[PDB]
Amino acid sequence: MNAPPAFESFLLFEGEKKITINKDTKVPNACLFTINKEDHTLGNIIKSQLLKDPQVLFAGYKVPHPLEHKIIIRVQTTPDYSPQEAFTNAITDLISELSLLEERFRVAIKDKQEG
Amino acid sequence: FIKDDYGPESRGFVENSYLAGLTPTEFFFHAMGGREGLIDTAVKTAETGY
Amino acid sequence: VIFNRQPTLHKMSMMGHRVRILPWSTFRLNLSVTTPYNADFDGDEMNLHLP
Amino acid sequence: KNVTLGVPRLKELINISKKPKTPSLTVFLLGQSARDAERAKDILCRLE
DNA sequence: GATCAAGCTCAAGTACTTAAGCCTGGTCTATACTAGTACTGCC
RNA sequence: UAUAUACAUAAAGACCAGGC
DNA sequence: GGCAGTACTAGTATGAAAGTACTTGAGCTTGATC
Numbered sequence A: 001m002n003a004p005p006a007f008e009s010f011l012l013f014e015g016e017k018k019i020t021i022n023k024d025t026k027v028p029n030a031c032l033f034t035i036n037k038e039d040h041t042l043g044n045i046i047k048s049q050l051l052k053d054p055q056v057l058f059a060g061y062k063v064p065h066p067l068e069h070k071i072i073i074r075v076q077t078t079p080d081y082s083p084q085e086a087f088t089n090a091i092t093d094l095i096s097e098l099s100l101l102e103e104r105f106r107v108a109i110k111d112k113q114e115g
Numbered sequence B: 001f002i003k004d005d006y007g008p009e010s011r012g013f014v015e016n017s018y019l020a021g022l023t024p025t026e027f028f029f030h031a032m033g034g035r036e037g038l039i040d041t042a043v044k045t046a047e048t049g050y
Numbered sequence C: 001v002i003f004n005r006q007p008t009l010h011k012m013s014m015m016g017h018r019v020r021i022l023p024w025s026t027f028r029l030n031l032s033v034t035t036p037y038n039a040d041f042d043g044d045e046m047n048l049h050l051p
Numbered sequence D: 001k002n003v004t005l006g007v008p009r010l011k012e013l014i015n016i017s018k019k020p021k022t023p024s025l026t027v028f029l030l031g032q033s034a035r036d037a038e039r040a041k042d043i044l045c046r047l048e
Numbered sequence E: 001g002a003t004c005a006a007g008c009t010c011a012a013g014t015a016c017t018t019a020a021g022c023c024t025g026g027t028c029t030a031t032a033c034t035a036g037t038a039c040t041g042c043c
Numbered sequence F: 001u002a003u004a005u006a007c008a009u010a011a012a013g014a015c016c017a018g019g020c
Numbered sequence G: 001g002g003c004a005g006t007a008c009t010a011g012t013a014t015g016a017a018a019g020t021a022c023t024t025g026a027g028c029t030t031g032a033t034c
């Protein structure tokens, strides 16, 4: 009777922003992103792309609680590199990876069939 | 068992481990020693609460 | 809320808590808290008294 | 020496029952009758 | 100095009060006797 | 046009089964 | 056709507790009287 709807995990209702950016006062150049209606699929890709960036000192995510679906990503970069720039370059670098993987998987298919 | 057997097997010593498994009688004596645990837990609670 | 489990043997079996509202049907409590109430999770139940 | 302990002994102290299941009296010896077992067994016979 | 009666104390027997905390389900709840009313059969 | 349909009833007890 | 008797229905009436405390009875000792 209290079971939440199945669709409630990936669907946003009125008023919920997808992303919420809040600066972090503990630290200089630290920012904390809040992603609604996402899980470890999306959060883990980005964290692991941020740690390749040598100008990123810290990156990590957590699901605060499993029953509510949101991600919280802290990022701390070096001075004169903004933590919002770090998080955008991460997303464009995956897109430039996954667009290279979808093209290389199509070539191996045609090679595989009758070849 | 034979009358007047005081040996370790007749009087309830179980020489098997739960992994190798208890033999038939050792299973019954092990059940007699566990009943004394269930009974205590049912009796003592009503005294300790009064 | 105040939060209880019978029988209450000592006073650590009634302790005030701070509500957080989550789905599904069961009260949920930290595991360190299962020492005072002497409650393991197999079919247990606990009362809730909202002051 | 089997003495009662646990909850059955707790009802005795609480109720202050006149007759406990296991009344017992410990007895200490003063002089040489403390060290020597033979001198002690002598007093042992006087108490029993 | 002795005996009997009365009073007081001790021991034994009989009677009275209690036996965990909370919670969820179910099934089942008089019978017998007496009186009054209605229907049937007989004069 | 105005005004109105406002809540109560499922008794109690007994035994039985189970839960922690 | 009318009255009496019998039967049926409805309502009313009634083994495997333990312990402590109090009361009663019996026995012993002391005092008074012969």
Ligand SMILES: [Mg+2]
Pocket: C039, C040, C041, C042, C043, C044, F020
């Ligand atoms: Mg349990």
